[PDB]
Amino acid sequence: WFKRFRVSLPWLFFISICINIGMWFERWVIIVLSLHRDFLPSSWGYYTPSVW
Amino acid sequence: CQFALKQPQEKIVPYVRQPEEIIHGRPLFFATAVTFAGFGVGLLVESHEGRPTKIEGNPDHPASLGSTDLITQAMILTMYDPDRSQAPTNAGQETTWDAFVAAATAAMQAQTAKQGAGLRVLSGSLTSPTLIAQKQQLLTQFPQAKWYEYEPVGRDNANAGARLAFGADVHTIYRLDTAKVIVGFDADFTAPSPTGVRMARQLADGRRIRKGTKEVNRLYLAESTPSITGLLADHRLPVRSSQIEHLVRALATLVGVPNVAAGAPLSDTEKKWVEAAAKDLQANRGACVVLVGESQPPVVHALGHAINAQLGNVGSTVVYTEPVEDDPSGGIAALSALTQEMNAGTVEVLLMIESNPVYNAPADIPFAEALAKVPLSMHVGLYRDETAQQSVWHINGAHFLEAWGDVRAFDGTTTIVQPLIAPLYNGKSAIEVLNVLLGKPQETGYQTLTAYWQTQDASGNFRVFWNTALHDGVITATQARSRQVTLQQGFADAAPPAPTQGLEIVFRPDPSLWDGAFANNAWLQETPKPYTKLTWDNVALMSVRTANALGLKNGDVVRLTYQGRSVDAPVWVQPGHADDSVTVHFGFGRTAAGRVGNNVGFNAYRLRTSATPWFGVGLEVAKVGENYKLASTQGHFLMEGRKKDLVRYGTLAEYVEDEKFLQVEKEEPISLIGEYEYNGYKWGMSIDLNVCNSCNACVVACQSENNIPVVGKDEVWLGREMHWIRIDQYYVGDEHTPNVYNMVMLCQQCEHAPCEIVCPVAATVHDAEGLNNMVYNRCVGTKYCSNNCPYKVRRFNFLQYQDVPYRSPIDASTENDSIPVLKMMRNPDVTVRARGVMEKCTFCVQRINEARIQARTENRRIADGEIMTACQQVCPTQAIVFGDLNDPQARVVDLKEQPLKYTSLDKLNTKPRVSYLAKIKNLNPDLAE
Ligand code: SF4
Ligand code: SF4
Ligand code: SF4
Ligand code: F3S
C-alpha cells in the first residue's frame, strides 16, 4: 500500500519472497489441508511430503 | 516399466488327460474343512482347475452356515505362500522324504525293544476322527508312548472347568437361536473360536431389526479388552479381568447358587452391571445363557455352568455332550508334563505335529532348551517354524487344501477334509506322518482315511456314503450325543484371594493372527485389527485413564516387565479398555515365520507364566521408547458430529415408540445432472450395521476374491492400504467407557457418482446395471477420482503393489517378475492391477458377470440368491445383503424399506447404492442411567 515499501526494492523483493512462499501455502491449504480431513473421519491422512 | 511392440507369445497348454469334471472357465466348488483348533469349520472352496482359488463357507455345515472366519478366509494365502516348506530338512540340511522314513522307521525299531517309552508326540488339540484313531494305534503298538496335546489358546480352562464342575469331562454347545439375554464374562464367542461363525450368526439372528421387531438379544459382555463381541454387546463393561473371576461369583449369588461364597467387592458400576444382568437372567430363564471366555480360570467356567444349569439352560440353550476332542486334559499342563520329560533325557522320538511350542511356550516351560536334549525330534508343519530351526527333522506340512484328512466340528459333525489340489510340494500331512511311525509308510492318507471310515460306516454301502460324505462335506452321522450331568457343588467353596493391586497384563490371542500359526499370512496381517486399526504391529493397549497415569501416548515403546521377563513393546491407547490393565496380542514376534511375519515385533508369548497364562497382576510398564510407526488404517476414531452420515445409532427404547426416529425427513434434492434409468438388475446392497461386529472377514474376502495386493507396513502408515472394504470404529463419547459402532465402508456405487465425472480419460464410468465400473486398464493414474470420492473408498496402486511382503514395493528391478506360487491364489477373473491404477469395491463384477452371462446363456433371469458378493457370503453375521433392486421379491428391496435404512452422505446427492441399517442396541431400563 505504501510507496515507501514499493519503490524500495529490498522491501519489494522481500514481499515478493513472502508472496511466492505465501501463495505456495495457499495451494497447500486448498489442496492438502482440505483433503486430509474431509467427510468420513475414518479417511483422514496427513501427507508428510517425501524427499522425492 | 514394461514395454513391447507386441505382447509375448502367450501359450495355451491344455490338459494331457482332461478330467470328466473340469470345464475350463468354471469354478467347480469343492467341500472341505479346516482344523482351526482341532475343530472343523466346513469350507466350500473354489477349485478352478485342480487348484483352489477362493475359500467359502459350506452352507450345510454347523460351524459355518455359509460364511467363513477371518483366519479361515485368508488361509488360501497360507497355502500359496512361497515361504511354505518345500522339502524336509535333516538337522537344517535339506533332505528327501524317503530319507526321513529311513531314519524314522529305524527309530521305531529302536523304540520297540523298549516298549515305546520315548515316543512322545506334541500335536495340538486334535479332534480329527482318523487322527484320533491313528493316535489309538500308536498308543497300543507302543503302550508307554504318550500324546501330549498343546494348543496355546485352546480350551485349557473351559475343559478343566467342565470336569471341575461336573466330574467327568463334557463339551458344552451353546445355542443362541433361543437366547434373549446373553451374559458372557470375557466371552469372545463371536471370535475366531471354533464356534465363532455360528455364535455370530445365531447372535445376529436375534438382533435382526425389521419394520416390526420388538425383542432383541442384550449380550452383557464384561471384558477387559475391547473385542469383536463388544461391538454386538449392548452393555459392555471394562473390567480388570481380575474382577471377572469374582464378578461371576457376584452373579452366581444373585442367581441362587448355594455355595459360591463370593468375595472381593466389585465396584459402584460393575456391581450395577451385575444386578441388572442377574435381574435379566432370572427373567426369560429358559432362553438365556451365561457364557465365559477362555481367559478366565477353571473355577469361573465351573460357575459358568453353575449359573446356566440354575437358570434352566440345560437342554434348551447349553447342551453338554461327549468331548469332541480326544483328551481335554491337555494344553499348558501337558506341555509342561512333556518338557519335564524332555529334561533328564526320557524322550527319544518327539514328533511335534503342528503345535510349534518353541515359539508358543509360556516362557516358564523351557521348551526351547529342553529341545535338542532329545536324539530325534521330528516336525510336520507347513512353515519352517521356530521348532524347525531347532528340531532335527522337519516334514513338510500339507496344508489342509492338499491333505486327505478329516475334522470333527463342534457337536461332533465330522467333515472329510478334501484335497482340492495335489500338494504343491510333497506334503506328507499328519496322517501321512503317523503312517511312518505306525509302520505303514507307503500307505497314503486317502488309503487310511477310508480304511477307518469303512469301519465307522455300518449303514448301507460305502460309495453311496463316502461320496455323499465328500459332496456335502458334513457327514452329520457322528453328532456328539447329549450327556446327563450332575453339577457337583462346592467347587467355589475356596475363598477368593486378596485382591492384588497393580497394572495387569491380560494375555489375548490376536483377532487377525490367532496364535502366530498364521503370522506369515500377509492377508490376515495387513487386515486392520478390529478396534485399533493397526496392521503389522503387536501393541500394549491401555485405557486412556491408565496411560495418562503413566504419561503414555499412541506411539511410545514401553518395556512390559511381568515376573522378570521384559518384552519392549509399543503402546496404543484404547478408549474402551479397562483401568490399570494392558492387553497383549498372541503370535507376532516370530524369528522364523518366513518373509512376512519375520520381524513384526513384540512376541507376547515370552511374558506368560503357565500359572497366569491369560492375565496377571504383576506388571511394570516403565516406558523406554519415544516414537514408533504403528501403521493404522483409520486415522480419526471419532464421529466428529457427522452422525446421520456415519453409522447412525439408537436404542430399542426409542425404536418401538418411533420406527423412523433417525431417518431424517428431507425433500427430494434438486439435481441438475439429468437422471438415468436402470431397467436391468439395478444392483444394490443393503448393509445391516446393527450386526457388523468387525470380524474383518469381509476385508479378507474382498482380498481373496479381487486379487487385492498386500501393502507393507511402511506404506500403510502412509495411508496406502489396498482395502476396497473397510470397517470403521467411531467411539462416541466418554473416552473412558465409549460405545463403539461400525460403519463398514465400501464403494457405495453412487448413481450420481462424483468420482466418475472427474476421470480425464473416462476410466471409471457407470453401468447400465447401476454400479460404478472401475476399469483398471484405462486408468492413467491421475488419482483425482479419490479426491472427488466423498467416502475415500477408491484405493490407488501407488507403487507396484504385488507380492509386497515378498518384494519391497519401493524397488523396480523385480516389479514385473511375479512369484509363481502366488499366481495361483489370484482370481482368474479379476484384473491383477499394475502400478498407477485406482481400484474400488466393484460389487464383485467377477461374480455378477459370470452369473448374468450364465443367465443370458440359459435364457433366464438372475435368481435373488444367485449373485452373492464376496463380502456378503463371508460375513458370519450376514450384515451385508447384495441383490437385485428391480426384482421386487428380493432380500434387498425388501431390506431397503426398513425404518433404519439410510445412505452415507445423503446431504450430497450421490444416490449411494449401498444403504446401511442403523445400530439399534437394546439398552436395559435399569442399567443405562
Ligand atoms: S459386514 Fe464385514 S465386519 Fe461386519 S460381520 Fe460381515 S464380514 Fe464382519
Ligand atoms: S462411493 Fe466413491 S468409489 Fe463408489 S461410485 Fe461413489 S465416489 Fe465412486
Ligand atoms: S462387493 Fe466384493 S469387491 Fe466389493 S467390497 Fe464387497 S467383497 Fe469387496
Ligand atoms: S481420475 Fe482418472 S485416469 Fe486413473 S486413478 Fe483416478 S481414474
Whether B748 lines ligand 2, by a CB cut-off of 6 Å, is: yes
* Grid coordinates of B797: 496402486
Nearest C-alpha neighbor of B559 from the set B571, B569, B549, B551: B569
User: Please, how many CA atoms are within 13 Å of residue B376, restricted to the half-sphere of its CB?
Assistant: 20
- Name the amino acid, one letter, at B113: A
CA Rg, chain A, in Å?
Answer: 17
Interface contact B634-A40, CB threshold 8 A: no
Give the residue, by CA position, lying nearest to ligand 3 atom 8. Answer: B702
Interface contact B639-A41, CB threshold 8 A: yes
Interface contact B791-A43, CB threshold 8 A: yes
Strands B376-379 and B288-289, sheet pairing: unpaired
Whether B755 lines ligand 2, by a CB cut-off of 6 Å, is: yes
8-state DSSP, B235: B
Sequence-ordered list of residues with C-beta below 8 angstroms from that of B540, at least 6 positions apart, any chain = B505, B558, B560, B569, B570, B571, B572, B582, B583, B584, B602, B621
Residue keyed to cell 457405495: B748
Interface contact A35-B790, CB threshold 8 A: no
> In this structure, how many other beta carbons lie within 10 angstroms of the beta carbon of residue A19?
11
Alpha helix segments (H runs only) across B53-96: none
CA of B732 to the centre of ligand 2 (A): 26
| B759 in a labelled binding site | yes
Three-state secondary structure string covering B435-465: HHHHCCCCCCHHHHHHHHHHHHCCCCCCHHH
Q: Is the Cβ–Cβ distance between B334 and B156 less than 8 Å?
A: no
Interface mutation vs chain B, best among A30, A43, A44, A48, most B CBs within 10 Å: A43
- The continuous run of DSSP H or E covering B416 comes out as strand B414-417
- The continuous run of DSSP H or E covering B132 comes out as helix B129-141
Residue keyed to cell 442377574: B278
Q: Is the Cβ–Cβ distance between B520 and B83 less than 8 Å?
A: yes
Q: What is the phi/psi pair of residue B166, to 5°?
A: -120, -5
Measure the CA–CA gap between B882 and B872, rounded to whole angstroms.
Answer: 7
Q: What is the phi/psi pair of residue B814, to 5°?
A: -125, 10
Sequence-ordered list of residues with C-beta below 8 angstroms from that of B643, at least 6 positions apart, any chain = B649, B732
Measure the CA–CA gap between B371 and B366, rounded to whole angstroms.
Answer: 9
| B852 in a labelled binding site | yes
B790, closest residue in chain A (CA to CA)? A39
Sequence-ordered list of residues with C-beta below 8 angstroms from that of B296, at least 6 positions apart, any chain = B157, B161, B185, B186, B244, B245, B248, B614
For chain A, give the number of residues: 52
Residues with a CB atom less than 6 Å from ligand 3 = B 698, 701-702, 705-706, 724-725, 746, 841-844, 869-871
Measure the CA–CA gap between B304 and B161, rounded to whole angstroms.
Answer: 9
Strands B569-573 and B557-558, sheet pairing: antiparallel
B794, closest residue in chain A (CA to CA)? A43
Per-residue b/e over B792-816, b at no fewer than 16 CB within 10 Å?
Answer: bbbbbbbbbbbbbbbbebeeeeebe
Q: Is the Cβ–Cβ distance between B337 and B183 less than 8 Å?
A: no
Q: What is the phi/psi pair of residue B289, to 5°?
A: -160, 150
Contacts of residue B904 in chain A, CB cutoff 8 Å? 40
Q: What is the phi/psi pair of residue B560, to 5°?
A: -65, 110
8-state DSSP, B482: B
Sequence-ordered list of residues with C-beta below 8 angstroms from that of B402, at least 6 positions apart, any chain = B79, B419, B420, B421, B422, B423, B424, B427, B429
Q: Minimum-distance ligand to the CA of B748? A: 2
Q: Is the Cβ–Cβ distance between B247 and B584 less than 8 Å?
A: no
Whether B789 lines ligand 2, by a CB cut-off of 6 Å, is: yes
Query: Which is the closest atom of ligand 1 to the Cα of B876?
Result: 5
* Grid coordinates of B673: 445432472
Contacts of residue B796 in chain A, CB cutoff 8 Å? none
User: CA distances (Å), B734 to each of B182, B544, B582, B742, in order?
Assistant: 25, 10, 19, 17
- Name the amino acid, one letter, at B843: F
User: Which of A38, A40, A44 faces B745 most closely, judged by CB atoms?
Assistant: A40
CA Rg, chain B, in Å?
Answer: 27
Measure the CA–CA gap between B777 and B759, rounded to whole angstroms.
Answer: 13
Question: Helices B158-166 and B298-308: crossing angle, nearest 10°?
Answer: 60
Nearest C-alpha neighbor of B572 from the set B599, B609, B602: B602
User: Please, how many CA atoms are within 13 Å of residue B700, restricted to the half-sphere of its CB?
Assistant: 37
Q: What is the phi/psi pair of residue B839, to 5°?
A: -140, 165
Interface contact A40-B638, CB threshold 8 A: no
Residues in chain A whose C lies over 2.5 Å from the next residue's N (breaks after): none
8-state DSSP, B501: P
| B871 in a labelled binding site | yes
Beta bridge mates, B573:
B542
Q: Is the Cβ–Cβ distance between B526 and B721 less than 8 Å?
A: yes
Measure the CA–CA gap between B319 and B479, rounded to whole angstroms.
Answer: 12
8-state DSSP, B726: B
The CA-based angle B11-B16-B19, given to 5 degrees, is 115
Per-residue b/e over B85-123, b at no fewer than 16 CB within 10 Å?
Answer: beebbeeeeebebeebbeebeebbeebeeeebbbbbbbb
Measure the CA–CA gap between B572 and B629, rounded to whole angstroms.
Answer: 11
**DSSP assignment of B694-707, as one string?**
---HHHHHHHHHHT
Q: Is the Cβ–Cβ distance between B128 and B478 less than 8 Å?
A: no
Measure the CA–CA gap between B839 and B721, rounded to whole angstroms.
Answer: 11
Whether B780 lines ligand 4, by a CB cut-off of 6 Å, is: yes
Q: Assign 3-state DSSP to chain B and report helix, strand, coil percentages, each to 5.
A: 20, 15, 65
Q: Is the Cβ–Cβ distance between B504 and B616 less than 8 Å?
A: yes
Interface contact A35-B719, CB threshold 8 A: no
Alpha helix segments (H runs only) across B79-120: 97-110
Contacts of residue B791 in chain A, CB cutoff 8 Å? 39-40, 43
Task: Please tell me whether residue B583 adopts helix, strand or coil conformation.
Answer: strand
- The continuous run of DSSP H or E covering B158 comes out as helix B158-166
> In this structure, how many other beta carbons lie within 10 angstroms of the beta carbon of residue A18?
10
* Grid coordinates of B354: 503342528
| B755 in a labelled binding site | yes
8-state DSSP, B921: -
- The continuous run of DSSP H or E covering B56 comes out as strand B52-57
8-state DSSP, B495: P
Sequence-ordered list of residues with C-beta below 8 angstroms from that of B821, at least 6 positions apart, any chain = B80, B81, B82, B84, B424
Q: Assign 3-state DSSP to chain A and report helix, strand, coil percentages, each to 5.
A: 65, 0, 35
- Name the amino acid, one letter, at B634: Q
* Grid coordinates of B752: 450420481
Nearest chain A Cα distance for residue B532, angstroms: 12
Nearest C-alpha neighbor of B259 from the set B303, B300, B298: B303
Measure the CA–CA gap between B756 and B357, rounded to whole angstroms.
Answer: 53
* Grid coordinates of B58: 459350506
Measure the CA–CA gap between B916 and B903, rounded to whole angstroms.
Answer: 6
Interface contact A38-B745, CB threshold 8 A: no
Task: Please tell me whether residue B103 adopts helix, strand or coil conformation.
Answer: helix
User: CA distances (Å), B3 to each of B7, B256, B812, B832, in order?
Assistant: 9, 78, 14, 17
